[PDB]
Write a protein that binds this ligand. Sequence first.
Ligand SMILES: Nc1ncnc2c1ncn2[C@@H]1O[C@H](CO)[C@@H](NC(=O)[C@@H](N)CO)[C@H]1O
Ligand SMILES: Nc1ncnc2c1ncn2[C@@H]1O[C@H](CO)[C@@H](NC(=O)[C@@H](N)CO)[C@H]1O
Ligand SMILES: [Cl-]
Ligand SMILES: [Mg+2]
Lengths: 138, 139
Amino acid sequence: MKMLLIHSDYLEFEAKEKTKIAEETENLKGKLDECLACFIAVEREDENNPEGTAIGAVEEIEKVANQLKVNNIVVYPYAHLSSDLSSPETAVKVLKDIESILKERGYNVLRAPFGWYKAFKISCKGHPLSELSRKIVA
Amino acid sequence: MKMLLIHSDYLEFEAKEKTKIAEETENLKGKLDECLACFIAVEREDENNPEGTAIGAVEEIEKVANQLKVNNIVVYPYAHLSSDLSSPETAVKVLKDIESILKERGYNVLRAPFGWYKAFKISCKGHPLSELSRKIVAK
Ligand SMILES: Nc1ncnc2c1ncn2[C@@H]1O[C@H](CO)[C@@H](NC(=O)[C@@H](N)CO)[C@H]1O
Ligand SMILES: Nc1ncnc2c1ncn2[C@@H]1O[C@H](CO)[C@@H](NC(=O)[C@@H](N)CO)[C@H]1O
Ligand SMILES: [Cl-]
Ligand SMILES: [Mg+2]
């Protein structure tokens, strides 16, 4: 799994174009202020252990989110972070689990929909811990 | 080299804090509209051929910019795209070369400062060619 975590003034997105793997969700458009935007590519190795991957990913997000005193999290599928992707069924499973576990831990989570081409706007705060890269190996 | 190309309504940045490897510059704030924002990690393999790498990079930028009818290009140093980075000296050499080559080919380029912490803002247009990853192996 590869993740880029961006401490943002806001993240706004709008689903524009369907792909063959687009999921119809209740958040085709969405916005979250004062948030950690987590851009996530689910990778082929993740298929070995989808559940452990989600757990590892949540541990890293919470480390960052707690250091920054941030409760708003956007889980944003971002397949461009890796050229070794998992299958779509595994990827959906892992993204929804990261969301589900974060909500159980009291975070305010907005999941952007899987399998769409989307427009987005972001403003990255630019302090020393505002942009962080994490590689998760379960 | 790893590149992530994003077709944007705009890209803005402001340098905030100097890292220990910051490039000396006066270009500390900048904005470019209707651009292809090119986030670039220069990798250690690029050390064997910095010239071919910049040429390889520009070739890929050109193919996208021509498809999308874009003339405005941001060259934005982005180490997080790769876990196997080049030296900072090689990275700047390559990024500068990318800019100068694009400039010779008629593109307008904004180059974001290397080794500074920057605030930034981007609006990605959201279509199938609006975000592209490219791996450049130099010829
Ligand atoms: N292994 C994977 N990890 C994360 N995301 C994945 C994926 N496989 C497919 N996707 C999703 O399908 C859209 C098209 O590839 C991807 N779309 C995107 O990454 C958008 N940023 C484009 O605007 C994403 O929703
Ligand atoms: N091989 C390389 N390729 C591209 N950029 C590189 C580099 N080595 C160092 N940098 C730059 O130094 C900052 C601190 O690592 C890097 N900073 C950044 O990538 C910010 N966007 C996130 O901190 C970047 O400016
Ligand atoms: Cl979804
Ligand atoms: Mg738009």
